[PDB]
Amino acid sequence: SLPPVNTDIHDWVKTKGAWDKGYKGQGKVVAVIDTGIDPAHQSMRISDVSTAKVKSKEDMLARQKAAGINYGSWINDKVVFAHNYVENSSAGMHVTGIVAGNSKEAAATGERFLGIAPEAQVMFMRVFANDVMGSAESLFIKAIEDAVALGADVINLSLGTANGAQLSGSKPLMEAIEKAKKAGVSVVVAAGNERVYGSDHDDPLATNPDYGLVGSPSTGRTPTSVAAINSKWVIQRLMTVEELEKRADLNHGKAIYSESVDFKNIKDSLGYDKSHQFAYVKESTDAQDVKGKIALIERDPNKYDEMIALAKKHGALGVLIFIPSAFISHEFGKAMSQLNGNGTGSLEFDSVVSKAPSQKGNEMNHFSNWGLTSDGYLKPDITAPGQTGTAMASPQIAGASLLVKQYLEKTQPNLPKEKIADIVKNLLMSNAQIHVNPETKTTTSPRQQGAGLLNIDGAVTSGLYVTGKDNYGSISLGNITDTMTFDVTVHNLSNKDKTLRYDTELLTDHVDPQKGRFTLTSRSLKTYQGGEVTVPANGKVTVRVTMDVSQFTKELTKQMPNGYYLEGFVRFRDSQDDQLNRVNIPFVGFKGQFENLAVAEESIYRLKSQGKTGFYFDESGPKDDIYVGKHFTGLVTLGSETNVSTKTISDNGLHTLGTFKNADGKFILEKNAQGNPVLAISPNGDNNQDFAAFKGVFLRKYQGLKASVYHASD
């Protein structure tokens, strides 16, 4: 009698297997720490308060008195505590809906949306940063402590800094998180949305492999660091064209269209019109055009509806070219058929959303943060479906953590509070499903996807989880050398011992050979068969994995001269049935010396003297222009003109030391008669080339930078 359930994510993450065992979050509590909720929504409800953790406003008041918390309040049986920590005079409503939404009514599409943990109650701490991030740290700590005190079971933390370190974070925050772990509280945090070094410019160069950007505090040992995969399905307003209701390879003539920066946007459900002019230039038109001509994003004369230049790319790119005065566009398989039917026909833009298969479906989110920790550790930990990428994956893992913690509290009743949260993390990671990049048909690097895509069923059905030497769901080897060895440990939590056959897939980065840049795809070097082990019930067993990577050192070192990653998965299956007890553990090591990778980019002078060029350096104007405003490692000085008919009263500002203004007025790196540039200064006081200071393009986080001067004899 209730509407059906939307299972776009539930079917993929396998939540049904958990619900059908009694695990829906009853008597559990998620604390969302975010920017704003509305506790009154149709989905903020629980069924049967008699089993909730917090059974009444009076219960809540009791806990607040006990914990010593004189602010905020209980709202309903769902949002049992809410408070503003930025008190001096929605984004995180989606996250709450995702962890714990339990709606009786249906939504826009006809179906009812249930979160991962529909019977969880919720606590809401409004916290965010305003001017100097890190000032908010104290309000976040007060929030974490209150979640812990009033009795949260999971904390969904909205907090990130880009290129976090695992062991060397912010002392008071990392400690408050450690107290949260000691209270049995899983702490889930988005990985981040900056993706890799230089993501806004180009792919990283093959000589610079420390390109990770995962953010603090998800990089901490304790928190669960969630990366983001794109959902297979989208729910959005489509665009229909009725002469095409028959060609199902086009969602029955319903297009996903996009726009960029809001030129003159849409006017819904009215049978507008347009025909096809694919000659992009001066055709006899009477006003759909293929942006095949990748020239410039200039929309056409008055009536637009552009379509993709690259068959099946289905990027539907943001930024409308392949001001205003029309509207945006951009799909393709609908274009090269919309352009059939005589030249043109009639369409309209729907006003009620629809489900439709995703254009980027089953692909890692472009912006989900990647790569190692700033100090060499393997994060993020796990992937879920989701600039709000990882931020929507994070609550999936928070809800999963509620469900698995339930499983543990039932079937391991005496497991101690100080040790349950890690087991929740470890079961989730070990039972995740390793992703395969559907484009390149090869395994996605664990630096991008962690221990794999979430699998809630596997985690609450197999009694297995996997572990490395350091006793963690994943393996950070360190430096690697031609022969990789590590010891894996399998744990069994069922009361019947299980036998597993296990192999080892090995991966490195794929590198574009014509451009000398990573492609941010992985390359599968070899799979190493590894034998068979029997995991005693209520026990553990350790095997050793050993690989000889000697055969690859020539080619990989040649394309990645400062070291490369060797990473991958040790995958266990059931010995008799290929599909039972699928568990695995990711590992990454670095064939080289990670702790020694170059910190600054090579100096622009040296680079020019090898015909090379910097990673951010614009080779714009005249030959050997180095305009001080460009981006290079070099020295900067300050210049001032010598005036023969006045006292000069004006400096000329900074310029690249070694460059001089030329005829046109441009600073060129001039060379002396031996061929070389000349760095030289004259501390005479004239404020012309009196000092030299350092300007760097930094390839890695740094500290203790200082400048010194020695005699050249020295």
What is the contact surface with other proteins in residues (CB under 8 A)?
87-89, 130-132, 134-139, 167-168, 170-172, 376-377, 476, 478-479, 593-595, 646-647, 649, 703-704
* Cβ neighbours for 174, distance < 8 A, ≥ 6 positions apart: 217, 220
Looking at the Cβ atoms of 75 and 421, the one nearer to Ca ion is 421
Stretch that binds Ca ion, among 200-208, 480-488, 660-668, 686-694 (CB under 5 A): 686-694
Looking at the Cβ atoms of 401 and 467, the one nearer to Ca ion is 401
Q: Could you tell me the smallest distance in angstroms from the CB atom of residue 595 to other proteins?
A: 4
**Residue 479 interacts with which of Ca ion, other proteins, none, CB < 5 to 8 Å by class:** other proteins
**648 counts as binding Ca ion under rule CB under 5 A:** no
Looking at the Cβ atoms of 146 and 289, the one nearer to other proteins is 146
Q: Could you tell me the smallest distance in angstroms from the CB atom of residue 291 to other proteins?
A: 45
**686 counts as binding Ca ion under rule CB under 5 A:** yes
**Residue 425 interacts with which of other proteins, Ca ion, none, CB < 5 to 8 Å by class:** Ca ion
CB atoms near residue 579 (< 10 Å):
7
**Residue 131 interacts with which of Ca ion, other proteins, none, CB < 5 to 8 Å by class:** other proteins
Q: Could you tell me the smallest distance in angstroms from the CB atom of residue 686 to other proteins?
A: 15
**682 counts as binding Ca ion under rule CB under 5 A:** yes
What tokens were used for 405? 């913690």
Looking at the Cβ atoms of 283 and 595, the one nearer to other proteins is 595
**SS3 call for 590:** strand
What tokens were used for 653? 């500002």
String of contacts with Ca ion for each residue 170-199, x by CB under 5 A: ----------------x-------------
Of 65, 94, 37, the closest CA to residue 398 belongs to 94
- Could you say which residues in the range 215-244 bind Ca ion, by CB under 5 A? 224
Name the strand (E) or helix (H) holding 309.
none
User: Position 180: which residue type?
Assistant: A
What radius of gyration, in Å, describes the C-alpha atoms of the chain? 29
**Residue 684 interacts with which of other proteins, Ca ion, none, CB < 5 to 8 Å by class:** Ca ion
- Range list of H helices, 541-677: 553-559, 604-608
Looking at the Cβ atoms of 127 and 428, the one nearer to other proteins is 127
Q: Are 605 and 679 in contact (CB under 8 A)?
A: yes
SS (H, E, C) 458-501: HHHHCCEEEECCCCCCCEEEEEECCEEEEEEEEEECCCCCEEEE
- Could you say which residues in the range 543-602 bind Ca ion, by CB under 5 A? none
The span from the CA of 283 to the CA of 663, in Å, is 45
Looking at the Cβ atoms of 203 and 381, the one nearer to Ca ion is 381
Distance (Å) of CA 680 to CA 312, 435, 591, 635, 693: 56, 55, 40, 10, 12
**Residue 704 interacts with which of Ca ion, other proteins, none, CB < 5 to 8 Å by class:** other proteins
Looking at the Cβ atoms of 40 and 681, the one nearer to Ca ion is 681
Locate tokens 């994003």: which residue? Answer: 297
**Residue 186 interacts with which of other proteins, Ca ion, none, CB < 5 to 8 Å by class:** Ca ion
Question: What DSSP letter does each residue of 242-276 carry, written as one string?
Answer: GGGTT-GGGTTTEE----SS-SS----SS--EEE-
* Cβ neighbours for 568, distance < 8 A, ≥ 6 positions apart: 443, 446, 504, 505, 506, 507, 586, 587, 588
Q: Could you tell me the smallest distance in angstroms from the CB atom of residue 665 to Ca ion?
A: 21
Looking at the Cβ atoms of 171 and 312, the one nearer to other proteins is 171
Looking at the Cβ atoms of 78 and 405, the one nearer to Ca ion is 405
* Cβ neighbours for 504, distance < 8 A, ≥ 6 positions apart: 527, 528, 529, 530, 545, 547, 568, 569, 570, 571
**Residue 323 interacts with which of other proteins, Ca ion, none, CB < 5 to 8 Å by class:** none
Q: Could you tell me the smallest distance in angstroms from the CB atom of residue 425 to Ca ion?
A: 4
**Residue 248 interacts with which of Ca ion, other proteins, none, CB < 5 to 8 Å by class:** none
Q: Could you tell me the smallest distance in angstroms from the CB atom of residue 670 to Ca ion?
A: 18
The span from the CA of 431 to the CA of 163, in Å, is 27
Q: Could you tell me the smallest distance in angstroms from the CB atom of residue 78 to Ca ion?
A: 22
Asked whether the CA dihedral 169, 174, 178, 183 is positive or negative, the reply is negative
Distance (Å) of CA 499 to CA 503, 511, 533: 14, 39, 6
Q: CB under 8 Å, gap of 24 or more: what pairs does 9-12 form? A: 9/231, 9/385, 9/396, 10/114, 10/116, 12/232, 12/385, 12/453
**401 counts as binding Ca ion under rule CB under 5 A:** yes
Q: Could you tell me the smallest distance in angstroms from the CB atom of residue 336 to other proteins?
A: 53
What tokens were used for 95? 């996250």
Looking at the Cβ atoms of 133 and 295, the one nearer to other proteins is 133
The span from the CA of 225 to the CA of 449, in Å, is 10
Locate tokens 């760097």: which residue? Answer: 696
**Residue 73 interacts with which of Ca ion, other proteins, none, CB < 5 to 8 Å by class:** none
Q: Could you tell me the smallest distance in angstroms from the CB atom of residue 132 to other proteins?
A: 5
Looking at the Cβ atoms of 318 and 478, the one nearer to other proteins is 478
Looking at the Cβ atoms of 119 and 381, the one nearer to Ca ion is 381
Q: Could you tell me the smallest distance in angstroms from the CB atom of residue 439 to other proteins?
A: 33
Distance (Å) of CA 259 to CA 326, 333, 350: 11, 18, 15
Q: Could you tell me the smallest distance in angstroms from the CB atom of residue 706 to other proteins?
A: 9
> Using CB under 5 A, which of 258, 337, 479, 688 touches Ca ion?
688
- Phi first, then psi: what are they for 523, rounded to 5°? -130, 130
Question: What DSSP letter does each residue of 655-701 carry, written as one string?
Answer: EETTEEE-TTS-EEE---TTS--------SSSSSS---EEE--BSS-
Looking at the Cβ atoms of 479 and 557, the one nearer to other proteins is 479
Stretch that binds Ca ion, among 14-22, 106-114, 258-266, 687-695 (CB under 5 A): 687-695
**684 counts as binding Ca ion under rule CB under 5 A:** yes
Q: Could you tell me the smallest distance in angstroms from the CB atom of residue 483 to other proteins?
A: 17
**425 counts as binding Ca ion under rule CB under 5 A:** yes
Name the strand (E) or helix (H) holding 567.
strand 564-574
Query: Which residues are near Ca ion by CB under 5 A?
Result: 186, 224, 401, 424-425, 682, 684, 686, 688, 690
